[model samples]
Target chain A: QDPMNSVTVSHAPYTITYHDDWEPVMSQLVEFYNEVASWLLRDETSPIPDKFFIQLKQPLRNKRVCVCGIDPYPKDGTGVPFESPNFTKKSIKEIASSISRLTGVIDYKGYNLNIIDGVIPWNYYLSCKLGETKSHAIYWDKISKLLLQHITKHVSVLYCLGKTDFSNIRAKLESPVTTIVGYHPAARDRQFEKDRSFEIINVLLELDNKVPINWAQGFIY
Target chain B: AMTSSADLTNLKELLSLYKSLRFSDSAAIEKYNSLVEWGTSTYAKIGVQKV
Candidate 1:
């Protein structure tokens, strides 16, 4: 049996599969799941799940959307060692819950969030050669393929949460399934809150309307 | 040190040969083989002298 319960929407039946490694803190996942599910289910009275101002329950069957992000989940099963210096079991739950909550609000609930397992390989390769982490190489080819496979399965839109994510995927995707690249929510501290929120809302609205978002411009790095 | 004119001429000819062979012909390959042989002979001479 999986440690963490997998949640699926009844009407959409979109399933969210996560590993048991996050089970040590099931309550947090459950809470975040309920919050997201409730929002998607259109419990109109509930506070519109934060920055996700737009409403979208599910795309018609055969239509899908993919959201890609860097590795935010706990790597050691203890907690995020780098960020949470005192990384503990409790911190693990907190961090995962935080990610789940934020992503849930972003309308990524039950949708696949391809959390890349490491620093994008291309970046890793460059850092290794240069003996420095400041500048890293990025290989768009492989990243593009990964994004394509996910999107090709009836993906209506591909939302890349950051520049690296967008560049990596953009290097491929000739006549791409609609792609939207934006500031990562995790970078909320660095970007203006209102503008970022609006950007996310706009994209969600666009996705709901089946309007294709142009892939040109607006990459900071 | 005083150098012999003949030796100087030979050195110049060797340098010209080296440059020409590098850009022009199979003569470079031949010269390389000869240099290898010369190096081997010099090593043998040193060993014999030491003994």
Candidate 2:
């Protein structure tokens, strides 16, 4: 009778089943969903509801690295962060190459990275309007904090991208999570290119006596 | 040491297993559908369905 035990959502052909560890916070997550839903309903021009997508491809148990993007791109998204429907767009390639420069893994997926958006995990422009990033960032602050808490607990490295500073939660992390703050790949100054965040991720991983992520694997598709 | 080919294979298998397990319970499915329906109806109310 406990619906939270098996929280699932479908995007057709495939369905997403949240991890067992997520059960404890399922109630909060559902409430968080409802909260976002109501906010989206407040505006007719808001993105169609389903655009608020979660992009956890691997189980939390298996995920050692978590990459946080600000949000999905405004349009033509298939729910994955830093990825577009085309998959090879320049925005996407920049991130792939960013990982390569640091960890020698051109594909973030090679590191079994679970990409997510920090601000409610949706495209802000799509969820509200073309320029609604900061507003939603504040709107979902509490729940976003909740998510970061759980994520840092489970992952060894939490790599946050963009101006949205997830590093603030570093002081409160209960687990030994290494929080790396980096600029968004789309930044014009190429700051992301110089961050060496993923390089540090590998350094931290090895120090923990864990095997390095395979940098040469093909796409998880 | 790098992750072995076998290790990658195992990881992929586990990921596939997770992907294959869909919601089978009526309660969970109902809750999910309700959320989707809520969005759909809200869209209809706003004429978001027209475009």
Candidate 3:
């Protein structure tokens, strides 16, 4: 009969659908999928069965700020960028510490930015290998640039997390978006307060005559 | 099962356009055509796996 794995295929249903408004994003993602698939087909050394992990939890149009992580957490991640594996308590604590200077809040439940309204938690690479990480970021660079260029029109600030050198992204941005390069929460040695990412965001928002991001626990609308 | 003969014909034709565009910007063109090939294979993958 079939040569492909029949048992494991049945275990995980691979049917993925997108929302109506997500059509534009899906179109790009599908194009990206096509590229990644072709690369894999030519040389199937890497296993990237889960290409859908790059999460756009909220609509791009509604986003005011962008926070890009290095890539998706290996297997247990929920695809939301900047999210730590198992929703680590210490990771959120580090993130919240950075924002606390601006929000004046000490604690947080999950990835601090996810709780804050108006932030787009994004990953630089759309997809990374199941077990491997950061290896695929270079491959997805072109497509990531395409999406970032699109997101630039809506967002006023770009908050780059981690030690990934985002110097190249500065040139591509068509608009005058304030980009805050900060250390990742996982970096235990580095203090989150050093970057002043949240402080800069609030000041920039006020300068643009826009409402500051409600860094409160829940959505503050 | 769904992306069968008719789908193959359409896909091949769509791929032809990209394959011909290879002489243009090699870097950008390569990425584009690679995606086309990827899309074709992925469609076949689902059909084979599903039914």
Candidate 4:
């Protein structure tokens, strides 16, 4: 399938599914590009190059835990906002590097760390209008279901990158799977303070012995 | 002890006077203020007359 429209890739460790809805935004940009072609040589219709679906590391099956951040960038009409086209690749590399540095996990080449990139749904931007209220609920439902169905048959643990992520989907875990919520690793660098990146390792250690049990017996159908 | 007893009696009388002062039907704070003023004036008058 054309990645520009939709694509599903199952890596050695896990399968990830994603879809892009930038065609509308790109279409508008192309229209402007045609009108201003004398000033700018690039044409929008020429193809918004396929976004590189980069997976930093493969998921570790049953032992795998997924970490994801909700894009808090601004939005536009049709609900999906214009994101810096460069954010996806940059964010993935940044997160992978930070995790590796903090955990002393070698690069993906060395089998040091295994983390799965979450698929941010196209509707995520549209639903952003709902603010953190229902937008989060929708994203969590989609991400959690996808993870359960494809990524890991049984996820031993899951890491929600921020409070918004945790609050939305913490209620859905089936087993004694641990969920850790922390500040985004991208914000770990500070001029005056020591890196708070240790929070991830601390949370992981705390949840080591604490097994998550099913809390949704009657309510979840 | 005698002076304390007399003070207690005065206090009781003052409280009784305050209870009756409700006839004026003023607001709670206003009533309390009026009672204090009346008590002070009456006490001053008694002192002057006795002296």
Candidate 5:
């Protein structure tokens, strides 16, 4: 005679799991999220059922590759996970200018930088931060651990932006992998060239010589 | 301003060269990369500030 299980409440493509043993507590967490998102996100105009990582479909079983970043909450659907969908080819999304400069294809008077890789956007926090009430340990710890459990379970590579983001990640994995770090582009003030970010895209993409693709048919998603 | 025939040819050649090419070859990549430099720029995006 349980109303919750008769038809489990779902957000579609986004859901809460009870992870067993912790079921009682996790269920309450789901309720907390439902209540918070309902009112706190009343003005959010982007796509609903939001989560980080552009592609969350297959990673749970096959271990996908990814490069991570910070907040990318949406003012609209154009730039949910990353990039302002409202913008176009002439502009990078409002995630990190530094990252755009590095990964962006360019041509100079003497040289040309290629775009042999694609940036897969993933964020650490999904919920918008509140003034002085900022503690997202619920998602960062419990839900993050749950998602990371699947992400780190397979043959995947991780990239964390900035020293602070790296510090925030709670990792203790046994996979044959390494997490790359880069200077986040938010505060660069257009001096992004020095970070050697382009140099690292090859690693972040991880297709450097592994697949025949030079750049197309990319993103290990 | 009138564009010269030479500029038009270059644009044509650019189109022909990249018509069906993909981004997996170094030569193709190098060749196409320069096209974006012709008076173009892209601005990166970010989110709002919680004040």
Candidate 6:
């Protein structure tokens, strides 16, 4: 679920809003969780995974980039919208490294879940249960359109990551700034393919002079 | 050092044995356990912090 008449959930310092045409999408998501919770995210603390409608490290008005995706896997602790916590995965580390190198933010300890930027890394599919198996279209189209519509107004660039066909989501976005596309780091490829994508993101943003996204005023910085 | 894929029982061992054979397939990476290696490797600089 996404914007324009969406339901918002409070994710502490951030507020997650669901905006989708299917009024029942949010409820269906919750219902899905309730039914599968026993077997799936039984212990996941967040009411919803970060990809669904994570507000972002920066407020809606300030975000400059949106790194959107799918496949967050099952983690026990708090899961940030896009990046993984604890460096428990290579993809997360690659993301952290690129953000660190690009922003010059000096994550200091590194692998911080919060990228401290306006970039909002989200997802197209919400349900790991239904995934993209055609049944997933039920949520993907509406919610994605909502996300595409909302983020288009705020961020400078939107990068589509992992198994997503850029044409699909790109087509959904009506008015967009800059949109980039790349494979998932986990895609059947070489060892270190994840961080390189973000490296390209920074480069592209620099060309547009959108570098150093003022994370100083961000949510988690 | 990695554990030997020697004859063993149970699912973990069964998978371990399979993983052992693949080690020679590619030198760049074999044990993807990528996330697990992040903490101690060069990439460890990006130690995970709370979001």
lDDT winner: 3
Each model's number of backbone clashes?
Answer: 0, 0, 0, 2, 11, 7
- For residues B3-49, what per-residue lDDT tens digits would candidate 3 score against the true structure? 13343344444444443554556666555556444443432111111
lDDT of 6 at A43: 31
Off by over 4 Å in 3: A1-16, A19-28, A38-54, A89-91, A100-102, A107-112, A174-176, A187-189, A218-221, B1-51
Measured against the true two-chain complex, the DockQ scores of the candidates, in the order shown, are 0.01, 0.01, 0.01, 0.01, 0.02, 0.01
Task: Give the clashing pairs for model 4.
Answer: A76-A81, A176-A212
Candidates 3 and 4, the one with greater TM-score: 3
**What TM-score would you give candidate 3 relative to the actual structure?**
0.62
Deviation from native of the Cα of residue A66 in model 5, angstroms: 0.4
lDDT of 6 by residue, B1-51 (tens): 011111011223323433443444443233334422421231111112211
lDDT of 3: 0.53
For model 3, how does the per-residue alpha-carbon lDDT over A1-221 read when each residue is reduced to its tens digit? 22111111111114334333344554565555555555533322222344343243355666777877756665545555555544564545566565556566555444446656787777777556666767576677777777677676677767776645553556656554555566666756564545555554554454344666776653222
lDDT value for model 5: 0.37
Model 1, residue A13: distance off in Å is: 28
**Which stretches of candidate 1 lie above 4 Å from their native place?**
A1-63, A71-153, A195-221, B1-51
lDDT of 4: 0.32
Top candidate, metric TM-score: 3
Candidate 1: tens digits of C-alpha lDDT, residues A127-163: 1112222211232224324334533344554545555
Pairs with steric clashes in candidate 2: none
Query: For residues A1-221, could you state the per-residue lDDT of candidate 6 as single tens digits?
Result: 22444434333222345434334445554444344334433333332545434433234565677766653343332334555444565666555554565567764443543555565656555434422223343434555566457666766666666544453554576654555555655657542333344444443344344663543333233
Task: Give candidate 2's error at residue A39 in angstroms.
Answer: 2.0
Give fnat, all candidates. Answer: 0.00, 0.00, 0.00, 0.00, 0.00, 0.00
Q: Native contact fraction of candidate 4?
A: 0.00
Reference-based TM-score of each model = 0.30, 0.59, 0.62, 0.32, 0.46, 0.51
Report the C-alpha lDDT of model 5 over A1-221, residue by residue, as the tens digit: 12122113334324533222233334544654554454444443233444322233221232234545444333332223444433432123322333434446432212101122323445555544432112343444444445444444432445555555555354534333434455554535643335543333333223222221133222111
> Model 1's lDDT to the true fold?
0.32
Candidate 4, residues B21-42: lDDT per residue as tens digits? 4444446546455544543342
Interface RMSD of each: 37.5, 18.6, 23.2, 35.1, 18.1, 17.6
